[PDB]
Design an enzyme around this catalytic site. Structure first.
Site, PDB file in Angstrom:
ATOM      1  N   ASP A   1      12.825  79.585  38.792  1.00  0.00           N
ATOM      2  CA  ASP A   1      13.076  81.019  38.824  1.00  0.00           C
ATOM      3  C   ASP A   1      11.885  81.845  39.329  1.00  0.00           C
ATOM      4  O   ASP A   1      11.945  83.071  39.321  1.00  0.00           O
ATOM      5  CB  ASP A   1      13.537  81.497  37.430  1.00  0.00           C
ATOM      6  CG  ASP A   1      12.411  81.573  36.410  1.00  0.00           C
ATOM      7  OD1 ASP A   1      11.395  80.921  36.584  1.00  0.00           O
ATOM      8  OD2 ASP A   1      12.525  82.296  35.416  1.00  0.00           O
TER       9      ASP A   1
ATOM     10  N   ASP B   1       4.287  78.413  34.140  1.00  0.00           N
ATOM     11  CA  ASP B   1       3.827  78.057  32.802  1.00  0.00           C
ATOM     12  C   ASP B   1       2.316  77.844  32.846  1.00  0.00           C
ATOM     13  O   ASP B   1       1.828  77.247  33.783  1.00  0.00           O
ATOM     14  CB  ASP B   1       4.517  76.777  32.327  1.00  0.00           C
ATOM     15  CG  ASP B   1       6.004  76.947  32.177  1.00  0.00           C
ATOM     16  OD1 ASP B   1       6.468  78.093  32.006  1.00  0.00           O
ATOM     17  OD2 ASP B   1       6.729  75.944  32.239  1.00  0.00           O
TER      18      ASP B   1
ATOM     19  N   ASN C   1       4.971  80.796  29.298  1.00  0.00           N
ATOM     20  CA  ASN C   1       5.694  81.186  30.494  1.00  0.00           C
ATOM     21  C   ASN C   1       5.444  82.672  30.846  1.00  0.00           C
ATOM     22  O   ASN C   1       5.514  83.559  29.992  1.00  0.00           O
ATOM     23  CB  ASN C   1       7.193  80.926  30.273  1.00  0.00           C
ATOM     24  CG  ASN C   1       8.001  81.040  31.513  1.00  0.00           C
ATOM     25  OD1 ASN C   1       7.562  81.533  32.513  1.00  0.00           O
ATOM     26  ND2 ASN C   1       9.205  80.576  31.452  1.00  0.00           N
TER      27      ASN C   1
ATOM     28  N   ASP D   1       9.504  84.103  16.835  1.00  0.00           N
ATOM     29  CA  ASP D   1      10.519  84.951  17.425  1.00  0.00           C
ATOM     30  C   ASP D   1      11.930  84.518  17.126  1.00  0.00           C
ATOM     31  O   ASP D   1      12.870  85.154  17.622  1.00  0.00           O
ATOM     32  CB  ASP D   1      10.322  85.070  18.939  1.00  0.00           C
ATOM     33  CG  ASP D   1      10.843  83.871  19.712  1.00  0.00           C
ATOM     34  OD1 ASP D   1      11.134  82.782  19.142  1.00  0.00           O
ATOM     35  OD2 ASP D   1      10.939  84.037  20.933  1.00  0.00           O
TER      36      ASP D   1
END
Ligand SMILES: [Cl-]
Ligand SMILES: [Cl-]
Ligand SMILES: [Cl-]
Ligand code: NA
EC number: 3.2.1.17
Length: 129
Positions: free
Chosen positions: A48, A52, A59, A101
């Site tokens: 995409d 990293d 990322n 998260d």
């Protein structure tokens, strides 16, 4: 810098990763092994267009700014190049936000596929901690 196994364990422990959010130190060392081979300078470009960075392959799509990831966020508020220093502070602190998260350590694909459900304690065995 390419860390030794026990050297990295000790650095991670000092920076408060042992049992952080319930993940014993062995998990973090295992993740680092398979993500970067203990190399703070590791980079890998994703399909995409994100990249990293560092010992934990954090990322640029969400966590750091590298200047070449259009539409991306910088949730750890750092340049991605800071994740490549021999000092792992910035990587560890950013990793702490990631694992908090909601998806835990499943955010690292190599952890999910190669560490999860194995004897991760093996990775800190022999180390003076
Ligand atoms: Cl462990
Ligand atoms: Cl960018
Ligand atoms: Cl969890
Ligand atoms: Na970014």
């Amino acid at each position: 810098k390419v860390f030794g196994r026990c050297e990295l364990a000790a650095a991670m422990k000092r920076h408060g990763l042992d049992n952080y959010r319930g993940y014993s130190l062995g998990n973090w060392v295992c993740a680092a092994k398979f993500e970067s081979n203990f190399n703070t300078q590791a980079t890998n470009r994703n399909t995409d267009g994100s990249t990293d960075y560092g010992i934990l392959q954090i990322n640029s799509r969400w966590w750091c700014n590298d200047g070449r990831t259009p539409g991306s966020r910088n949730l750890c508020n750092i340049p991605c190049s800071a994740l490549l220093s021999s000092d792992i502070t910035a990587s560890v602190n950013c990793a702490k936000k990631i694992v908090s998260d909601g998806n835990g350590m499943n955010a690292w694909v190599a952890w999910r596929n190669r560490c999860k459900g194995t004897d991760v304690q093996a990775w800190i065995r022999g180390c003076r901690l």
